[PDB]
């Protein structure tokens, strides 16, 4: 209607700062976000969208293209690439990580 949330997880959204070889908080400030995968049924597309809990900042809004490689680097830190940045999710718990990864793996299968 026109998108369905196929999962939600609590995570600190990060992007990799290539110049300084460090992870930084997406959107410029620390704190946890609520991160969803949304599925547009009409076009069979997916995206990751997340808002900071404390102040509702949109900190991630990125398409999940067919063929994306989703790297589960650790049980609570998962990451993927796009042309502009590497995104990372530092999950609040192993359970949050698992629910999100399960949905991501499903999306990538049906793309």
């Amino acid at each position: 209607m026109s998108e369905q949330s196929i999962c939600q997880a609590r995570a600190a959204v990060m992007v990799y700062d290539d110049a300084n070889k460090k992870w930084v908080p997406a959107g410029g400030s620390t704190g946890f976000s609520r991160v969803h995968i949304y599925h547009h049924t009409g076009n069979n597309t997916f995206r990751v969208v997340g808002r900071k809990i404390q102040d509702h900042q949109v900190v991630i809004n990125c398409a999940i293209p067919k063929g994306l490689k989703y790297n589960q680097a650790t049980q609570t830190f998962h990451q993927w690439r796009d042309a502009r940045q590497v995104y990372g999710l530092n999950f609040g718990s192993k359970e949050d990580a698992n629910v999100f990864a399960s949905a991501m793996m499903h999306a990538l299968e049906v793309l």
Binding site: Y16, K21, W23, K69, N71, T74, R81
Partner: peptide
Amino acid sequence: XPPX
């Protein structure tokens, strides 16, 4: 990928 970068490391964590």
